[PDB]
């Protein structure tokens, strides 16, 4: 075990912070604390919409959270309802301020943290792991990507003996900084235990 987190490796180089705000010293900690609370309680409820990324930026008490999706019909709710009560549970826990603006990424198949979850779900639903992997990469490759690769690990198909498993089309130069590459994890829970899906999507150069 030895590979580096692609994201942490490309900070301010090809990938921007999921949270953007200054602090100082005497306040940074509890700032991030509630900040982390947000993204987590967001993920728990907005899972149904399958979020690809939650952005958070702050101001003098003013706090903005620009959440992403590829199917926002769930976030927006009936006519425009669920989005309000959402923010109306937000300041119910921030004790500060509110924010909406839920923009939507075009191709969901070109978002890795999105992909993994849709795959990791197929796992829980007892699907062919070898097949779903090649299916995933196919759907990613045939939808414009310049590379792809998906890795799972754990008791594949409830095997007494756990093992690694993956496939890849195109190219995925994880060593190259100049390459913009998306990545995300998904935790495949099941009766036999916890698998784990990691998705690598190489979008292109820069």
């Amino acid at each position: 075990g030895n590979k580096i987190h692609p994201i942490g490796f490309r900070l301010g180089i090809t990938r921007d912070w999921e949270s953007r705000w200054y602090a100082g010293k005497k306040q940074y900690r509890h700032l991030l604390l509630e900040d982390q609370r947000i993204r987590g309680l967001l993920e728990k409820e907005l899972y149904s919409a399958g979020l690809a990324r939650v952005d958070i930026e702050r101001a003098a008490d003013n706090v903005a959270v620009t959440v992403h999706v590829a199917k926002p019909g769930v976030v927006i709710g009936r006519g425009g309802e669920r989005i309000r009560v959402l923010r109306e549970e937000l300041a119910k826990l921030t004790g500060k301020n509110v924010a909406l603006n839920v923009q939507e990424v075009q191709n969901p198949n070109l978002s890795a943290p999105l992909v993994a979850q849709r795959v990791a779900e197929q796992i829980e639903r007892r699907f062919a792991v070898r097949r779903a992997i090649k299916q995933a990469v196919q759907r990613v490759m045939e939808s414009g990507a310049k590379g792809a690769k998906v890795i799972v690990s754990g008791r594949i198909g409830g095997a007494e003996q756990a093992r690694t498993e993956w496939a890849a089309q195109g190219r995925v130069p994880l060593h190259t900084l100049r390459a913009n590459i998306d990545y995300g994890f998904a935790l495949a829970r099941t009766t036999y235990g916890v698998l784990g899906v990691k998705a690598y999507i190489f979008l292109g150069e820069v």
Binding site: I7, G8, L11, K25, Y28, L32, D35, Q36, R39
Partner: protein
Amino acid sequence: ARKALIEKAKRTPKFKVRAYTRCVRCGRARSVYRFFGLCRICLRELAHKGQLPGVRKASW
């Protein structure tokens, strides 16, 4: 010593120095960076995600 232990450090104790740090995410007692209230592991995790603003891998 999981959910139970972490509780004591949250509430202010009998004496002054009796109060102690603990990760504000995993609840690890030992090695807690006070700047975040986080442990060295939780620190590395979220810093990798980008959830820790302005913090990038150092190199020189």
